[PDB]
Symmetry: C2
């Protein structure tokens, strides 16, 4: 009964650990874009 949770949680945790690495890269990619756009605004006089 109860012990069957062990494999379920082990496998879910592996999936979640992988998902964290894919979201870290996606978030980082968006940060690089924000920096690029900020610079473009700054070079054009529009970032204060």
């Amino acid at each position: 009964g109860s012990e069957r949770q062990i494999l379920r949680l082990k496998q879910i945790n592996i999936q979640l650990a992988t998902k964290i690495q894919h979201l870290e890269f996606s978030c980082s990619e968006k940060e690089q874009e924000i920096e690029r756009l900020n610079k473009l605004l700054k070079q054009n006089g529009l970032l204060g």
Copy 2:
């Protein structure tokens, strides 16, 4: 025994699920930041 192993797996689980929620919120806020920057660029003639 197995009860304690399960408790530990659940704690890891919630730690991972909480980090995913956070990165989903962070990613979304960055996409909104990208939208706002793009709209500024568009208004100042920098996006064609």
